[PDB]
A paper describes a structure:
The ligand-activated transcription factor farnesoid X receptor (FXR, NR1H4)1,2 acting as cellular sensor for bile acids is a crucial metabolic regulator and liver protector. As a member of the nuclear receptor (NR) superfamily it translates ligand signals into changes in gene expression and affects a variety of genes involved in bile acid, glucose and lipid metabolism. NRs share a common architecture of an N-terminal ligand-independent activation domain followed by a DNA-binding domain (DBD), a flexible hinge region and a ligand-binding domain composed of twelve α-helices (α1-α12). Especially the C-terminal α12, the so-called activation function 2 (AF-2) of the LBD, has been identified as crucial for NR activation since stabilisation of α12 and concomitant binding to the core of the LBD provides a surface for co-activator binding.
Structurally, unliganded FXR-LBD comprises the α11 and L:α3-α4 regions in an unordered state and can bind the co-repressor. Superimposition of both spectra, however, revealed significant differences with additional signals and marked CSP. This indicates that the activation function α12 in case of FXR is not disordered and exposed to solvent but even in absence of a ligand is partially stabilised and part of the core LBD. In contrast to the initially proposed mouse trap mechanism and later refined models suggesting an unordered conformation of α12 in solution in absence of an agonist, our results indicate that α12 is ordered and forms part of the core LBD also in absence of a ligand. However, the recruitment of co-activator by the apo-form is not reflected by our NMR studies and might also be a crystallisation artefact. Still, it is possible that the apo-state has a very weak affinity to co-activators that is too low to be captured in our system.
Author numbering:
A (entry chain A): 241 to 471
B (entry chain B): 740 to 752
The structure:
């Protein structure tokens, strides 16, 4: 029973999965990946559209996490802003690894490597994608890991860090159990998942540097992205 | 206000 979810944990897991499965990528965007013109300009604009959708989806997923809307309102904002980049990279890794057809993923990578973005930041992104892929996580593990990243008591400007920690700890307990259910032969699996959260945190710096570099034809970001990234 | 767009999305049913 150290590896069996209690009824309340199973209810919590269903609730997180419902919220996680609710929204995916709009076909408008996946269609553009496939048929839009190929240029550094077009590719950068698709990637900003994808990022804007990522933020929208993340807000909606986060609002439905149990307890989140009971938190102080400024802390809610602080969590959404603090987690945005890590959650984007985690989501985009899943999309690249598991949610797109082969060919969609091939063309998306080709567009990523030809969008005016420096290889200094593209190379670690694809290294992380493969590093996450190696873990061969289930959808449940991805969803729980994402909620753990979002509900981090360590983000800047949180007023009531204990309240966030109380929300995050049940998710960690669930994920521990999920690792023993889904990879029973690999006892280090849960530690490996948290080890990847360390690499994931390197993208706060990577993203901040990328924002300082050139932007194809010096194109701008959407208002929402400017706001969540403090541009 | 600060973070107007994020607050819009957070408080929008």
């Amino acid at each position: 029973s150290h590896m069996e979810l209690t009824p309340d944990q199973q209810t919590l897991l269903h609730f997180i999965m419902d919220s996680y499965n609710k929204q995916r990528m709009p076909q408008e965007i996946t269609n553009k990946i496939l048929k839009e013109e190929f240029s550094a300009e077009e590719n950068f604009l698709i990637l900003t559209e994808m990022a804007t959708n990522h933020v929208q989806v993340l807000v909606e997923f986060t609002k439905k996490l149990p307890g989140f809307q009971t938190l102080d309102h400024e802390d809610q904002i602080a969590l959404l802003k603090g987690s945005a980049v890590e959650a984007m990279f985690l989501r985009s890794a899943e999309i690249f690894n598991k949610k797109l057809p082969s060919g969609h993923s091939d063309l998306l990578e080709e567009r990523i490597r030809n969008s005016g973005i420096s290889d200094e930041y593209i190379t670690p992104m694809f290294s992380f994608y493969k590093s996450i892929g190696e873990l061969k996580m289930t959808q449940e593990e991805y969803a729980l890991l994402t909620a753990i990243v979002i509900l981090s008591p360590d983000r800047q400007y949180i007023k009531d860090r204990e309240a966030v920690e109380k929300l995050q700890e049940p998710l960690l307990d669930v994920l521990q159990k999920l690792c023993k259910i889904h990879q029973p032969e690999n006892p280090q699996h849960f530690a490996c998942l948290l080890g990847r959260l360390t690499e994931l945190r390197t993208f706060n710096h990577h993203h901040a540097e990328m924002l300082m570099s050139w932007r194809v034809n010096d194109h701008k970001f959407t208002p929402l992205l400017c706001e969540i990234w403090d541009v | 206000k600060e973070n107007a767009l994020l607050r819009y999305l957070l408080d929008k049913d």
